[PDB]
Scaffold this motif. Sequence first.
Motif, mmCIF file in Angstrom:
data_model
loop_
_atom_site.group_PDB
_atom_site.id
_atom_site.type_symbol
_atom_site.label_atom_id
_atom_site.label_comp_id
_atom_site.label_asym_id
_atom_site.label_seq_id
_atom_site.Cartn_x
_atom_site.Cartn_y
_atom_site.Cartn_z
ATOM 1 N N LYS A 49 -17.410 5.774 12.960
ATOM 2 C CA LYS A 49 -17.113 5.232 11.929
ATOM 3 C C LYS A 49 -16.511 3.963 12.539
ATOM 4 O O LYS A 49 -15.840 3.070 11.307
ATOM 5 C CB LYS A 49 -16.129 5.798 10.684
ATOM 6 C CG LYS A 49 -17.244 6.557 10.150
ATOM 7 C CD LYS A 49 -17.355 7.107 8.523
ATOM 8 C CE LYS A 49 -18.299 5.903 7.757
ATOM 9 N NZ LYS A 49 -17.651 5.631 6.791
ATOM 10 N N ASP A 65 -12.396 2.488 4.341
ATOM 11 C CA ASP A 65 -12.662 3.229 4.640
ATOM 12 C C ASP A 65 -12.488 4.572 3.637
ATOM 13 O O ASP A 65 -11.383 4.538 2.900
ATOM 14 C CB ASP A 65 -12.732 4.674 5.964
ATOM 15 C CG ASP A 65 -13.533 5.168 6.300
ATOM 16 O OD1 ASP A 65 -14.973 5.138 6.706
ATOM 17 O OD2 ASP A 65 -13.918 6.434 6.098
ATOM 18 N N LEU A 66 -13.051 5.401 2.876
ATOM 19 C CA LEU A 66 -12.606 6.776 2.200
ATOM 20 C C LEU A 66 -11.531 7.534 3.098
ATOM 21 O O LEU A 66 -10.817 7.731 1.976
ATOM 22 C CB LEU A 66 -13.441 7.870 1.955
ATOM 23 C CG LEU A 66 -14.907 7.229 0.545
ATOM 24 C CD1 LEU A 66 -16.009 8.097 1.187
ATOM 25 C CD2 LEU A 66 -13.722 7.039 -0.832
HETATM 26 CL CL LIG Z 1 -16.602 5.390 3.200
#
Ligand SMILES: [Cl-]
Length: 96
Positions: A49, A65-66
């Motif tokens: 990512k 991002d998570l």
């Molecule tokens: Cl994410």
Amino acid sequence: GSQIPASEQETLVRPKPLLLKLLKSVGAQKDTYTMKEVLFYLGQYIMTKRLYDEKQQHIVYCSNDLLGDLFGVPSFSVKEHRKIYTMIYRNLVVVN
Ligand SMILES: [Cl-]
Ligand SMILES: CCO[C@@H](c1nc2cc(-c3noc(=O)[nH]3)nc(-c3cncc(Cl)c3)c2n1[C@H](C)[C@H]1CC[C@H](C)CC1)C1CC1
């Protein structure tokens, strides 16, 4: 890093739902993971990512991002090992 025992890698853990969500995006879905697994999968997730890069002074940037939501920080150094374990431990339970 120097004061972290190799036995840590064998700890058996059950990820909480958000951590499990992330893990399942990079590895096999299982109920019980080793810490070796969790670290590997998180590292691959980070790379995939693009949350980490060459020459970023070893900082992971996770605010978009998570992962930022899991860890509760916008960024962290991959050199801060004990802080990394603390942020991980907030998102799992140890199985014995
Ligand atoms: Cl994410
Ligand atoms: C293939 C991808 O590699 C990852 C990586 N780079 C590292 C550099 C150094 C490091 N330590 O001192 C220095 O000078 N460098 N340490 C770790 C490290 C390893 N195992 C446990 C701990 Cl706590 C830290 C490194 N990781 C781990 C796999 C990675 C594990 C997930 C954790 C949330 C973040 C770090 C990159 C982030 C994407």
